[PDB]
């Protein structure tokens, strides 16, 4: 028993991890196969021409000791694709993925290519993640693990005013109405993922946390006119059907574990704590809960 | 900016998980050089865990009742010696993937990361505190034996923990790499109890320098205590005493913050009064004690 804010072993991703240098601007760089991948930022607006400008011998790329030769340079939205003249001979079973608000992955914090350190995150609803960075952290990466092979999902870039982040998918592609400038963004209001908090209920239960249960059921439609005024994202049917495996392990129906969500936030807790907690935890996926609670491996 | 609850790369530890079977039981080692460190219940049936004579069912033993795997790679056991509460088994190879290492005993209070393992897998890592009580708030299932907690500051994997079992209020007991018990428990199913637990005060401190440091302030108070005035009221909400020994070492993010350790330790006693009244610190409701004054500095600068 117990609940802990799991990462992935971060192993088959530190092995890519490597210090990519363009002028005075050092970062993170991935690499995979014969490719160092890193954010555009780093020959630092016009990247085209910022990058016509540059050869191949302006980047310096460094995997530990050994410094790696740039062959070719392209650009692929956000992100710089190097060429290199070696494979990475730690290259895992890779894909890259573009994940959905609400999903979680580990991200593996890295300055001067040296990993520092690995911590969970949730996409947040409004394209933000609430990471640990540094200057020299952009580069570093998010991942998930399923099997054997890792799925990239994301690459990070920069900081917005409120410490929250922002980076793309290992396409180039921000997450949310972000842009790599130096103009005035700001997230917008974020909202809380109903169906993670939904979840993380379900893995309190299982570890026999169970005073905010009750007698009452509800709607779809009920549940989610009550999550739209605690600003909570609307639960869909999709999500029910997901939550159904735990439903069926501790023998709460979802629209039943909604009625304690409902409860517990016109009520609050009172004092209480569930899992160690005074706050509802949005940050656990329903596969996060039934990945620890049994005990999955890769 | 941004403060989370950051484990260490486990690279450097995958490398060295191994599965470990003697008879039914199947549990996690750990391969370092030619040697398989793992709990030494690994040997027991269940007709004998109440009272267990480990020394009279180790020589019962043969290298070949040791099924050892790396992998695919089924390794050959050719010694096995006691240490405490640890087995350690001589393999006739060495790890390849050994990192620089080190054996060291913590103190309460201090944190690590978990490797959790299942059959020789690594399944997942996370961030824990040794609590005052000497017990873990982990999260094992059963086969997570012999899972390993440890740090990597400066490329050098110290090893401070192994898992042995689980208490009755859900909480995790276990050895140093040299099998020597966290608190006073012992490898044998009788009647076991975690003492009561008590929060880190040192680290709540610390917790509230990292949130002054990432531009919270809404906690902090126009007053100061002295240390024994601080002691008395922290005991009777079952904090740890804060010794002269924890002020020194606050003494960095006291000055890099511009805020003495005796006026953080008035803001606490007035939070731990006040709770926190709808507000939060460090997206927390909480006072968050997992958080050493070194891990704080080593996530903030
Ligand atoms: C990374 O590239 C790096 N070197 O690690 C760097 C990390 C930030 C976090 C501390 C330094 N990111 C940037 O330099 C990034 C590059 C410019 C500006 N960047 C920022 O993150 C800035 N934020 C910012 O400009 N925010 C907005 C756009 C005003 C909302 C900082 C002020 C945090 C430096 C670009 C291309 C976005
Ligand atoms: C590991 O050895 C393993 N195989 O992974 C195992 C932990 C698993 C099994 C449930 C969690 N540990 C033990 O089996 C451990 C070995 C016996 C009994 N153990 C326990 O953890 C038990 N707790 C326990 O007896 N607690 C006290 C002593 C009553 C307080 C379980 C009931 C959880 C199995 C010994 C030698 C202590």
Redesign the pocket.
């Given at each position: 028993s117990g609940f802990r804010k799991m990462a992935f072993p971060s192993g088959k991703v530190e092995g890519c991890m490597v210090q990519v240098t363009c002028g005075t601007?050092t970062?993170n760089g991935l690499w995979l196969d014969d490719v160092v991948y890193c954010?555009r930022?780093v020959i630092?607006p016009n990247y085209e021409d910022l990058l016509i400008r540059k050869s191949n011998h302006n980047f310096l790329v460094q995997a530990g000791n050994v410094q790696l030769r740039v062959i070719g340079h392209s650009m692929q939205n956000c992100v710089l694709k190097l060429k290199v003249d070696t494979a990475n001979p730690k290259t895992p079973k890779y894909k890259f993925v573009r994940i959905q608000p609400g999903q979680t992955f580990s991200v593996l914090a890295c300055y001067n290519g040296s990993p520092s350190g690995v911590y969970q995150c949730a996409m947040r609803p409004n394209f933000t993640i609430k990471g640990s960075?540094?200057?020299?952290?952009?580069g570093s990466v998010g991942f998930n693990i399923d099997y054997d092979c890792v799925s990239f999902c994301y690459m990070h870039?920069?900081?917005?005013?409120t410490g929250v982040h922002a980076g793309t998918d290992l396409e180039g592609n921000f997450y949310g109405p972000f842009v790599?400038?130096?103009?005035?963004?700001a997230a917008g209001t974020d909202t809380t993922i109903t169906v993670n908090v939904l979840a993380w209920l379900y893995a309190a239960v299982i570890n026999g946390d169970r005073w905010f249960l009750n007698r009452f059921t509800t709607t779809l439609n009920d549940f989610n006119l009550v999550a739209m005024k605690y600003n909570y994202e609307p639960l869909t049917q999709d999500h029910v059907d997901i939550l159904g495996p735990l439903s069926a392990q501790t023998g709460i129906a979802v629209l039943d574990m909604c009625a304690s969500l409902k409860e517990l936030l016109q009520n609050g807790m009172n004092g209480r704590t569930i899992l160690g907690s005074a706050l509802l935890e949005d940050e656990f996926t329903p596969f996060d809960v039934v990945r620890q609670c049994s005990g999955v491996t890769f």
């Open positions: 601007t970062l954010p930022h630092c960075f540094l200057n020299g952290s952009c870039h920069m900081e917005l005013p790599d400038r130096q103009t005035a963004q």
